[PDB]
Symmetry: D2
Subunit: 242 residues, 4 copies
């Protein structure tokens, strides 16, 4: 997370840490609890190549990474069949927990938005995670959960910004329809925040608008953060998630 | 170049080295001389981001990289407008030299194939460059120009190989129509060979089948090297080069 | 710390973490609280070149590094005048805290050994710190305070052991009189433990026998860990410490 | 080599490159031909630990490293018995070639100085090698043999300069009598030049004043380059070299 601050303990109960087995259970990606037995993440975190379920663990809401570790095993890894790279699209994945979680006030699910829900500029939106604080600058220990309020940019305006300083033809789409744009040179998501949630307060309720996907660096000029549009993959999510 | 050996001095007169200004004029990509004043390379070498022409030089055929440097300036960089990433496609670019080179027996152009030209499966072809010898294994000094014989893998067969051990749906194409496959676990192109030529001897004439583009690692199981199909972009090439 | 285990919360109340200002207050060396206002460390940690007082902080006993931080400023950095390198000797330094610490059962001082105290082999001795777990293998998060029981080796035996597979003449002393030897191929101190204490239980009382100084790698054959002999610099310590 | 320029082909015929086996015969240290069958170098290059003769090769004067390789085998490695560390001193070693070198105008021996020569400040002295061009800045390809005119400093002044900005006592010797000082913030030897020669023109004859040994970084304020004083070890060299 570029800019912003450390998140208070009561905020973002849905935020999860994805862990890989090595010298320790290392955080590689973020995620969000969308159902007591289901975690929503980015496909690039757990794909496109087949991963070993034994080498993966899910860590629920934690104020400081690695401190209060209570790792949960994964039953199923479901990656969108249209996924290959974050730039092509379909950067969405589902993780089925071995057993459903005990929902508390400190740890509970995030509400998915309706199919017709469009997130326009000016809407209060926040992105969370334990990712890099800047380009090539990792989150320092004790690795606190960071939060940043990001401004939403319209897809066509964001696509136009991505063409500035690029050879890519103006008619050639960089920011696709299954993507969402948010952030600026001071506020953005980064490497390590991938798979994590982008929540927006719509009529007094928090709705996950996006999934941290990609971008040309972090908080760089004319390069806002790109997220997988949750509304676009609602039919695919509901096929596995009740 | 993975496998093979040091190329003899008389072989591959079209092979060029692309140089970027830093502590020294360092090799970042390969290429091929297609016209005395034009160089064919991969778009990812010089894009999608707009490059500074003063910070770029072209080095003609050299037995040992950096030894007899005769750096040539560039007047134009023409990156295909459909290019953004090597996986999406259109990984092709043209470099116009400031002055046309004096064509000789040691340094001369490569013949481009006709519009209908097909490269059969199992056909022996050659890939050249000063790239890495293996995954995370740089070409050791005095950096000789390397060559390797690579077998052609048909597009549908190669696409199926990329789906082996991947979540990506069988109906979702990884190896695209504007792409070409070549190599195995012992013979392949690698990081640094990008932009370089893939040559096939057809009826006693060397034709450039592909431009080194991408691949999931170098000489990895079920992951052959991906090349930009020259035949697919002949009209775009002929629009700029006479 | 090579080998051993995570130290219990009730053990080593004198253990100190030395912090340097950078992207965060990074641990660079260990230390021991010898007086409520004085910290004993290695000279190579804070020298031989003059350090900025404002860029240094002292962290008292932590079960997990960086998690429960309460950084203390330093008022004086006293490095032994005979110090240049750890191999030459006099690898000892004192850090005066700006204010004295409120002593408790969990955080208290270590007793310095008497002037004529020798530490022969077989004695129950432990070395503590948050250093590397092996050669080029960092202590993984949540960075637990580690301990290891290390066997003491006689100075002349350890000195002759350092000459094994070395061109250095047998008459040329490697392990000097101001040094102490401890550890083996399974039990040792490493990079990051430097400045930390080597404590021995003598007559039911814990005495600081040494200060982590140097060694040819960590837990390598015929290369035990080298410590600064505390008894040798007792007069120098007592000149500043009450 | 920090500062200066690329050496002309006719200059420094005694300069040699020391090679170690791995992915290629990599340069690790410099040296000098003092006798047709003997090479003078620094002890830290080949010690204090015993090295395998088969993994070591000697390369005679080369304008560009690796380009015209004619690797020569070594029969004996003689490291000074007083050596352990460059800072302690005796950083001198002799390498006996398997066969004597066929001496020519391009490749010949350097004259050792008489015992009486102290090399005072103001002598025209040069240091040569293929080492780093600055701190953490490696010599760029085609790796040309570099040279730099370095100002000689008197031992007591160089020792006092090393105490500036250091805790080390003014009466505690840093620069020993078996050492020689040369260089400034623009002209110095660096990592990779170690073992190489420091030559001074005395009575129209090039005499090797020193062997590149150590220093606190390269071209750093009040930290000139430290060389092993050849005259000090003249008796030791003559015990092996005819
Ligand atoms: C022109 C190439 C467009 O495709 C991109 S952007 C891009 C990039 O710059 N990235 C850095 C590091 C990996 C990749 C995506 C990273 C990233 C950016 C964001 C948005 N700031 C969020 C999460 C995240 F992981 C930032 C890469 C590697 C590729 Br391929
Ligand atoms: C699932 C991701 C598919 O897209 C790929 S493959 C891929 C990869 O493994 N590469 C390594 C290093 C960069 C990228 C392409 C590299 C490469 C392979 C080849 C084929 N052996 C030729 C040239 C070349 F530069 C080999 C990357 C970074 C990305 Br994004
Ligand atoms: C010529 C060998 C003697 O001088 C030495 S040993 C030595 C070494 O191998 N070290 C590694 C990394 C730095 C230095 C000291 C390190 C070390 C070893 C120990 C004992 N295992 C304790 C603390 C500690 F920092 C282990 C170095 C850099 C030097 Br100079
Ligand atoms: C205060 C510690 C004194 O002893 C030194 S100086 C010193 C240092 O800064 N060095 C850099 C890298 C290794 C070591 C010696 C290096 C060096 C300097 C020079 C002179 N500029 C020539 C050759 C050479 F290898 C420059 C080290 C590692 C040690 Br241990």
């Amino acid at each position: 997370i570029v800019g912003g601050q450390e998140a208070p303990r009561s905020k973002w109960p849905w935020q999860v840490s994805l862990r890989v087995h090595g010298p320790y259970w290392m955080h590689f990606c973020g995620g969000s609890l969308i159902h007591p037995q289901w975690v929503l993440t980015a496909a690039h975190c757990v794909g496109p190549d087949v991963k070993d379920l034994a080498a993966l663990r899910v860590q629920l809401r934690e104020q400081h990474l690695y401190y209060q570790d209570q790792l949960l095993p994964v039953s199923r890894i479901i990656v969108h069949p249209q996924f290959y790279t974050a730039q092509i699209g379909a950067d969405i994945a589902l993780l089925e927990l071995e057993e459903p979680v005990k929902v508390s006030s400190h740890v509970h699910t995030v509400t998915l938005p309706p199919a017709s829900e469009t997130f326009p500029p000016g809407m209060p939106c926040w992105v969370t995670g334990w990712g890099d604080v800047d380009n090539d600058e990792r989150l320092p220990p004790p690795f606190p959960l960071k939060q940043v309020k990001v401004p939403i940019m319209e897809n066509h305006i964001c696509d136009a910004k991505y063409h500035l300083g690029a050879y890519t033809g103006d008619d050639v789409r960089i920011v696709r329809d299954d993507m969402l744009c948010a952030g600026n040179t001071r506020r953005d998501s980064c490497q390590g925040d991938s798979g994590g949630p982008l929540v927006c307060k719509v009529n007094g309720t928090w709705l996950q608008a996006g999934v941290v996907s990609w971008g040309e660096g972090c908080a760089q000029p004319n390069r806002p953060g790109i997220y997988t549009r949750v509304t676009y993959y609602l039919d695919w999510i509901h096929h596995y998630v009740p």
